[PDB]
């Protein structure tokens, strides 16, 4: 069934799986019209599909033209997500197709189950984890490619840069979720933390800075502090 703290290590076994987050698929700015009413203007989004073992990120860019002339966009977004995920599975060689797809929001189960009726051996699963993948648009390079897109487009990333050369996928995933949790709770501080030291750069083919192991620990610590902090400022503790 669902995915939680008890079966947490299944993410890093050798059964191919993908997380799908649809939280940045349909994105709008809300504004006042000349008549003083409110209207939304859609901006480009993305489906965040991530292999948690390898770090391969299939960033499908959702161009605002997909919404043109459509009603009930928040509902369509789930079905467009599902369609793009099933197209991705179908584009992949059989030996690369996932055995499980884990959706981060339960509203995706039915749209995806229906789009994947052709793949009855792929388990569609929810999770009880509160994963921070919505903050994926706080990663500058990901945000940039999404906002610049002029047409639908798939962009492939490794969200773990070269980390797997030095650490395990369990550890890489824990770092990523701590980075993203931080960026979600206080983007400015999180980003300040990541770039304070100009001498640490982001390689052109990476998303995150080129930290040593020792620097990562300092970074990871600083991000925990921020998360605990914001938790105080929020609850006054």
């Amino acid at each position: 069934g669902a995915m939680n703290s008890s079966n947490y290590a299944e993410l890093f076994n050798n059964d191919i799986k993908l997380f799908v987050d649809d939280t940045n698929v349909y994105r709008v700015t809300v504004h006042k019209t000349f008549e003083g009413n409110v209207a939304t203007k859609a901006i480009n989004g993305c489906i965040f599909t991530l292999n948690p073992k390898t770090g391969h990120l299939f960033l499908k860019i959702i161009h605002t033209s997909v919404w043109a002339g459509q009603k009930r966009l928040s509902q369509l977004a789930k079905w467009k997500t599902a369609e793009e995920v099933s197209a991705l599975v179908r584009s992949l060689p059989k030996e690369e197709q996932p055995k499980q797809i884990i959706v981060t929001r339960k509203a995706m189960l039915d749209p995806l189950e229906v789009h994947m009726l052709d793949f009855p051996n792929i388990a569609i699963r929810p999770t009880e984890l509160r994963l921070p993948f919505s903050a994926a648009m706080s990663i500058d390079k990901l945000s940039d490619v999404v906002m610049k897109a002029t047409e639908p487009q798939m962009v492939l990333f490794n969200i773990y840069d070269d980390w797997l050369d030095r650490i395990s996928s369990y550890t890489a995933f824990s770092r990523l979720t701590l980075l993203l949790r931080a960026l979600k709770t206080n983007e400015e501080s999180a980003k300040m933390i990541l770039l304070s030291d100009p001498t640490i750069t982001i390689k052109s083919y990476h998303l995150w800075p080129s930290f040593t192991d020792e620097q990562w620990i300092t970074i990871e610590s600083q991000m925990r502090d921020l998360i605990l902090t914001e938790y105080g400022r929020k609850y006054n503790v």
Partner: protein, 300 residues
């Protein structure tokens, strides 16, 4: 008016005939049921005093032969049998009627309940769900499973209802994934009403047969079947006006007839609230909604 004679009543049992029922005591001098209206299917059903486990019964049409009930003490149930000897059978019935050992099917002349619950129910059609073709009558009990339940184990004793599954390739046209799942009109109309059922009468027939098996036997797979069939229609944006109107009538009499005390198990809260309040047809079941709200407002 036809007659189902009983050889005898060796064990204490509650006997049902359609929506009527009465208590027979162990070895009471009871020799069956008379004045059964011709022109409808009927169901005679049993719950033993000693083991309310296993309600069971027989669907039959008196136009299709002379049928009698005889307790079998080896198998331990009241068995429907066919008498092929016409004169043997008239003679048996006349003696039992003269000695007045038969109860009268007790139909009030104002009463269309049975007709309204069985309008589309036909034994010849029923015999293709309960497959047992050496008999003209059909046995059902509380425990028989459906063909779809066995997919998710003895196929001979199954209820071969039409398998309806909303998340199936049958239900969902490639490329209309969202359209067909939110608006099941293509599944209801093209696949179901048109490719398997052929007309609404046939679709309504199985819906009716499912309900009755649910109510009389508490057959859980029939309840799912009855419910599935309602949900497919309630979830279709495009339904012929005459089907909606007929559906409202059908459900109305089904809701009317359900025992008040069995509503908690036989009615699916999700399906009804969706059908009456969220679905495309939320506005098209005026009679069904009025009786549901006045008799089971709890469920909603």
């Amino acid at each position: 008016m036809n007659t189902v004679p009983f050889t005898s009543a060796p064990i204490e049992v509650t006997i049902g005939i359609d929506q009527y029922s009465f208590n027979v005591k162990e070895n009471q001098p009871f020799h069956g049921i008379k004045d059964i209206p011709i022109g409808h299917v009927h169901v005679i059903h049993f719950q033993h005093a000693d083991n309310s486990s296993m309600r069971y019964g027989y669907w039959f049409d008196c136009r299709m032969g002379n049928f009698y009930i005889q307790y079998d003490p080896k198998d331990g149930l009241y068995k429907m049998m066919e008498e092929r000897d016409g004169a043997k059978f008239e003679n048996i019935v006349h003696n039992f009627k003269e000695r007045q050992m038969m109860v009268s099917y007790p139909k009030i002349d104002e009463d269309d309940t049975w007709y309204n619950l069985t309008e589309f129910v036909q034994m010849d059609k029923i015999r293709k769900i309960v497959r047992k073709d050496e008999n003209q009558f059909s046995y059902v009990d509380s425990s028989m499973t459906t063909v779809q339940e066995n997919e998710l184990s003895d196929p001979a004793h199954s209820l071969n209802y039409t398998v309806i599954n909303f998340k199936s390739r049958e239900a969902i046209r490639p490329g209309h994934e969202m359209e067909d799942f939110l608006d099941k009109s293509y599944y209801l109309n093209t696949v179901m009403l048109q490719g398997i059922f052929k007309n609404s009468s046939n679709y309504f027939g199985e819906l009716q047969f499912a309900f009755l098996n649910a109510m009389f036997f508490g057959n859980y797979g029939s309840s799912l079947q009855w419910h599935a069939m309602i949900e497919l229609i309630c979830s279709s944006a495009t339904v012929p006006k005459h089907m909606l109107d007929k559906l409202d009538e059908i459900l109305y009499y089904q809701i009317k007839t359900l025992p008040e005390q069995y509503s908690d198990i036989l009615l699916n809260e999700r399906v009804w609230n969706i059908c009456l309040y969220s679905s495309f047809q939320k506005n098209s079941l005026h009679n069904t909604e009025k009786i549901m709200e006045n008799k089971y407002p709890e469920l909603l």
